[PDB]
Design a binder for this molecule. Structure first.
Ligand SMILES: C[C@@](O)(C(=O)O)c1ccccc1
Ligand SMILES: C[C@@](O)(C(=O)O)c1ccccc1
Ligand SMILES: C[C@@](O)(C(=O)O)c1ccccc1
Ligand SMILES: C[C@@](O)(C(=O)O)c1ccccc1
Ligand SMILES: [Mg+2]
Ligand SMILES: [Mg+2]
Ligand SMILES: [Mg+2]
Ligand SMILES: [Mg+2]
Lengths: 357, 357, 357, 357
């Protein structure tokens, strides 16, 4: 009855604020692909994609433009849609860019299915809107700016910030961490992110030191695909090893969890397979006794997490704010889901035009 | 001293012959991306990429065009190059399309490094050119055509063909297999490919039946990423489970081998990471006691396999023949490496122009 | 096209400097076998072998003299050569002295293949020359001399020395370690080597104490072949257990890594199988997330490590300096690969004659 | 009180009879090193070593000549001696040629310790002389000669022969096996030896076929050091996988047994560490529920096996017969230990002189 009637994509390069100086590389602007999925019902669904690097921007768009044919005239059934894409790419590799594109479609699809029903996504999922404690996500900003950015966080009501470490010397890592703690006090969270920049032995040395300082969690210490490696690091700690931003599909998640690679997880809405993949990852975490947090996509992650049995933390890191309405809000360090059908994504057309690639 | 000075790409849609009717989907023409990598030495390296589906053709090209910047002015050092790309994409995901593109670059790089030295690739790798038994690769062609295509194979000196099964009924699978055997006799190889089209239990039922018929190997019975699944199937057989065409990187290989997912392997030159990744996969197979065969890219695979300690079979499946010279040859069902520097890839410019996308 | 035309060997007993008083036994002079491998191309390849003890000197030479027949008239293809030797000794045992001799041949072969191409080895391997942090390797020298030898190290720009411990009493071990630290400060590396001189329980007691003192790594605590044992020791530590100097072939490496016997590795160019074996060990370390350092053969190790994805530390321990040119250099505690084709080994004929056995 | 006063070695190249055409390579004459170990007691101990290949003959001798110094003036205490050699070579590698030489010394030492006591070795070991069923060991002799050689065996009272297979085709393997069976009947043993000439998958195919024919055991199907590999093969069979001729030390044995690599074992007196190592391997087999047979050295193996709790089969393969007295005898396919002190090795001085290298 409800058919997908079209797919429109726009590739922009949006302004951020600070610029995710990461534990390995850094980011000035943000490359995104905005997605409009048209339906026979007179409702348009929305989503966006993050390209990490501009190198992949035109590619990711071109890929979606070419997939539009596969999905038009198909029924608006995300679960079915997803299955169909998985069979169509089984040879090329239903992962990477292909999977990210599929995820963008799923997200829009679910958004449109939410509007069809004049219901907020979380509600459609069968749950009640609840706030979610979130943490302010910073970068590899050095002692001073890291410290400055945390006082502001807390000033805005945040109860934890996340900072990027992995300086040439463990000593620097610590420096940064201590300055923030002094600035904010013992009743505050400090999550650190090594951005997969260390080897296993080094991660053990550094993590132990930090453990002492009292970090909330140590995220992506080594190469992301090295599950076993992560297990080895974790095995030497009390503090939780955090991971999962790079899991392409619930299938990669399953693998990592199967070996006890981590104590916490934080799937990425795009990489995990959109709404459809999330639901699945959430069931996994549950069975595995893994508190599940989010990575980017605060808009949809807010709804998603409220339907997650082991929901943990939402990550505040506004990639898309310059081109969308400020529907998602934060009340006392807790994200509040807007009371709008679907995900609550409303475009800022005039701005969009400013950043078109 | 030797620098990369440029990257040119052309996307064509080449004519094949028969059309890889596969155990799940089928292929009429072939979408490729041809790569020219220019050097300060006045030598151009070559490679090509297979896109499986035209959906990904423009995308894959656009991706390479955008990566050209990363590699220009870099030294012509494939091993170093590769490392550098791996750090640059650690966030986006050094797999999928990104990895395939990286592999295409590596292949060209190694080709150019071979010309720089006026030496054939295999030679540069430290080995001697030797023929490699190959098998003629067919598709899901039905009883009649499968049978017709095998008599010809053997007529051309082949000692084994590979066919695609996975018909709605096990009975059909068998039919196809028996007709070929009758046509060719007991002293002939028959490799079957299910193209990841079955569940685990069904693969056990079907594989056992075939086991009886005497197949050389059962390839990709279930979903490719389901390593454990493959282990379960294998555990119930005597005949070898074959896999590895979808392993994106030696890192995915390692995982599968670690659980004893298969008895044989056949990495894909593109997906495994080009020459650089191959060398690594080959060391793995060795330690693991896994006879290693190839998947597509007969041109480079010929050289590659001769430097493989556990070299098994080369797969004949000419994707690129319409746009390149017939340097690779087959003598009595054995592939013969041409005595040309590099890989031996020479373009057919006039033809290329015919298929430009 | 390029054939091996001859094999010449000379056995010398070279002067050292200090004399590797080891955590079990000690060394005054150095017994080596120098290898010249002649080719149809008018290029001679070089390598040398270390005999550890003079007991094995004449034996090792005699063994190479007798193998010369096997390799003459063979093509200059190290990878092929190596395979051929492995089949020829499968009965006698392709390990021990036999393997060491094979490794010496491989090394020369690769050196000659580098000259054939007027290219530095590392370059031929596909990588870029880069410096490698190295550490000055000392012996079981006692408190005073150990301390004296470190001040000089650092004076020469080294950032870490390695010392031999394993005194009758843990107290002595510590003494030595503390004196060096005082002498050099907290920003300096101290690697310790027990030379396989302890039992498992004792290694646990001693390693824990040292862990406190802050050693960089604990190397070969127990009998080298006792992998499991090493795993037990490691399991009780935070500090890395280092091993691999005695691994005869990548096959022994694989075994040790398979059980998690260590956190770091340091293969020996000779024992691991020359260039050919190295390439393989390096792929293993990679997959296993094991930072790989070297053992002896600083000349070739320098090139080797630059092509190692998980390259760690180069060990400075000049066995051969009295009979070769000072091509390898150290700039600020980093080894610099000479810009000479092959490995860069140039003999000092007049000196050689002084030490001929 | 009893000291070792000297070590004499002679390297001969002895005539055989048939010539161990092996499942990979073949042998015309036999290269041995005969050992005389002098004592303060006026008793000379004896042993011999097998060099597999003449390539290693001069080397092995030279090695023993150089070790003589280490052992002279030492007490005639094999157990202590052995320990001492193990510490002295811990750096060079107490395996390979070095270990073989050590084993030759141990064997002589024990022989001399037997003469000192005017007691037969087995007796000194604490056991009673008993016959041991043995099997006649043949080579890769083809259908006809294999068949001829078995009729004779049985004619001489043997109840089982061992033949070498591994022909280019499984069909040949079978041919050979069937002809012998026809020739001898169902109440006869047929042990087959693949000489490590197959890959894992192929070994599974071939072994299963043979299993059908009814072989006594399948020996060294794949590369000897590939324990895991052997475990995989064994796991697919009912018939016993036999191995252990290449285990250098009880330490290599332990490893293989630990993973269930085989159902039977057959250590080599030389490679396992002489008498001293045997005693140890025998305790291992016992605990592991592994029937233990021998490899070469029928003279000492006869005594050894009678002191083995899980003693199985003795292998008849007379390497040394041309230079020693016919003390060891066979009565009805059972080896009979001579009633002479020590091992019973008496040289044939006049003959020795004929084969001196
Ligand atoms: C640091 C990071 O891994 C995170 O935790 O959010 C991150 C990665 C990529 C883009 C933005 C942020
Ligand atoms: C059937 C196949 O998996 C193979 O074995 O080659 C194949 C897959 C994709 C394209 C061509 C061929
Ligand atoms: C101490 C040592 O094991 C090392 O680490 O180099 C060593 C062993 C043998 C010879 C020289 C040095
Ligand atoms: C075939 C063999 O492995 C055996 O079983 O004895 C053998 C190996 C080496 C020399 C002689 C015999
Ligand atoms: Mg992160
Ligand atoms: Mg296939
Ligand atoms: Mg050491
Ligand atoms: Mg044998």
């Amino acid at each position: 009855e409800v058919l997908i009637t079209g797919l429109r994509t726009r590739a922009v390069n949006v302004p951020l604020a600070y610029p995710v100086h990461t534990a390995v590389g850094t980011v000035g602007t943000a490359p995104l692909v905005l997605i409009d999925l048209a339906t026979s019902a007179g409702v348009v669904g929305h989503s966006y994609l993050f390209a990490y690097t501009p190198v992949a921007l035109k590619s990711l768009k071109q890929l979606l433009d070419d997939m539009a044919a596969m999905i038009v005239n198909e029924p608006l059934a995300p679960v079915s849609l997803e299955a169909m894409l998985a069979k169509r790419f089984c040879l090329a590799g239903y992962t990477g860019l292909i999977r990210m594109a599929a995820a963008g479609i799923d997200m829009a699809a679910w958004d449109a299915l939410g509007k069809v029903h004049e219901t907020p996504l979380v509600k459609l999922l069968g749950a009640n809107a609840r706030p979610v404690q979130a943490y302010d996500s910073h970068s590899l900003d050095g002692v001073k700016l890291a410290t400055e950015r945390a006082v502001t966080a807390a000033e805005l009501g945040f109860r934890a910030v996340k900072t990027k470490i992995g300086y040439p010397a463990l000593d620097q890592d610590l420096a940064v961490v201590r300055s923030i703690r002094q600035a904010v006090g013992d009743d505050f969270g400090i999550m650190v992110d090594y951005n997969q920049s260390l080897d296993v032995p080094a991660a053990i040395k550094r993590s132990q030191a930090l453990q002492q300082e009292g970090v909330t969690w140590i995220e992506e210490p080594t190469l992301q695909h090295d599950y076993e490696g992560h297990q080895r690091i974790q095995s030497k700690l009390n503090v939780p090893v955090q991971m999962g931003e790079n899991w392409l599909g619930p299938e990669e998640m399953f693998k990592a969890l199967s070996i006890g690679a981590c104590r916490l997880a934080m799937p990425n809405a795009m990489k995990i397979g959109g709404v459809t993949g999330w639901i699945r990852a959430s069931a996994l975490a549950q069975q595995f006794g893994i508190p599940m947090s989010s990575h980017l996509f605060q808009e949809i992650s807010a709804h998603l997490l409220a339907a997650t049995p082991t929901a943990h933390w939402l990550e505040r890191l506004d990639l898309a704010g310059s081109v969308i309405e400020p529907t998602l809000t934060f009340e006392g360090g807790n994200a509040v889901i807007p009371d709008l059908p679907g995900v609550g994504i409303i475009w800022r057309e005039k701005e969009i035009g400013k950043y078109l690639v």
